Design a protein around this ligand. Structure first.
Ligand SMILES: O=C1CCSc2ccc(Cl)cc21
Lengths: 87, 103, 138
């Protein structure tokens, strides 16, 4: 039910397995219950996990969807990780 | 209403959700299922304030408008060694590099 | 092949912008050419005289990021049983596309090639949302 995503700097993020299987790349690195991301630091990986909760919450709900915030200071590293994970 | 949370201890961060009406003790049961430590060995904090087991998350200030899916509220977690609780502490995340000159 | 039907039957509609973006409404004329209408500020509404069978889509006025209208990408006014509501909302963007929007908003397109990322991201950044591109489709 939960899996552990580990950032390049050793922070451990524990998210629901369904939220993590939203990434095809993560599904493959599990297909074990831990994934080590040698290239993604914790200020990026935390945003990735916030995005999982946001997507699962707001896909197919037609209320009003708020904007997903991205601070400029992290935008480029986040893009690099999103590109690699096909998030 | 659902409230969205980050439960944090040291270098550990749990992303989970709960109901505004659920209790601090029920949140401790969620942590127990994940980190395999009983509630008796756990203390939960909003910032520096210790949270009482019988209190609902809404009364400790976790509301649907502050504990949001894209911006979850942080709950501090501290463990108990044998007797004696460790102090509360949370390793900060890494820092972003200097914004490029472009931008 | 994607165009407004010249029904000449009026259809009364409400553009309701439930997004934080400035919305550009776009009418596809009887030849399929996109026609922009005046922009809608965030959280504002505007009432519109249209016709049954006409085709509208909606976009971020500044960046042309795609938006949803009553979900789905096209709004076609129907029979007024009175005005039809067109609720314009954010989609759930992919995290990739949402990062491209923020980076594009901070970097002038001159300097895309000055950022240190894989080359494939230069092409992804340079491939701007575009109505004619999105109109290409079976
Ligand atoms: O998030 C980052 C930040 C540092 S650079 C990098 C390179 C590849 C991938 Cl997948 C991620 C990242």
């Amino acid at each position: 039910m939960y899996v552990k995503l580990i950032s390049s700097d050793g922070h451990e993020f524990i998210v629901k397995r369904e939220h993590a299987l939203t990434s095809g790349t993560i599904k493959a690195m599990l297909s074990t219950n831990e994934v080590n991301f040698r290239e993604i630091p914790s200020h990026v990986l935390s945003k990735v996990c916030m995005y999982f909760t946001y997507k699962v919450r707001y896909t197919n709900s037609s209320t009003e969807i708020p904007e997903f915030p991205i601070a400029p200071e992290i935008a480029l590293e986040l893009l690099m990780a999103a590109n690699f994970l096909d998030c | 209403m659902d409230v969205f949370l980050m439960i944090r201890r040291h270098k550990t961060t749990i992303f989970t959700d709960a109901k505004e009406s659920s209790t601090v003790f029920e949140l401790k049961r969620i942590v127990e299922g994940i980190l395999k430590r009983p509630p008796d060995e756990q203390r939960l904090y909003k910032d520096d304030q210790l949270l009482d087991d019988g209190k609902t998350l809404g009364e400790c200030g976790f509301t649907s408008q502050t504990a949001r899916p894209q911006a979850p509220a942080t709950v501090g977690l501290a463990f108990r060694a044998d007797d004696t609780f460790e102090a509360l502490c949370i390793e900060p995340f890494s820092s972003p590099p200097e914004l490029p000159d472009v931008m | 092949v994607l165009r407004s039907v010249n029904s000449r039957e009026p259809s009364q509609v409400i553009f309701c912008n439930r997004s934080p973006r400035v919305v550009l409404p776009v009418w596809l004329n009887f030849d399929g050419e996109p026609q922009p209408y005046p922009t809608l500020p965030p959280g504002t509404g505007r009432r519109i005289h249209s016709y049954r069978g006409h085709l509208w889509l909606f976009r971020d006025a500044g960046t042309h990021d795609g938006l949803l209208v009553n979900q789905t990408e096209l709004f076609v006014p129907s029979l007024n049983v009175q005005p039809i509501f067109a609720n314009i909302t954010l989609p759930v963007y992919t995290l990739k596309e949402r990062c491209l929007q923020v980076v594009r908003s901070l970097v002038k397109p001159e300097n895309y090639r000055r950022l240190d990322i894989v080359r494939s991201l230069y092409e992804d950044l340079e491939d701007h949302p575009n109505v004619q591109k999105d109109l290409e489709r079976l």
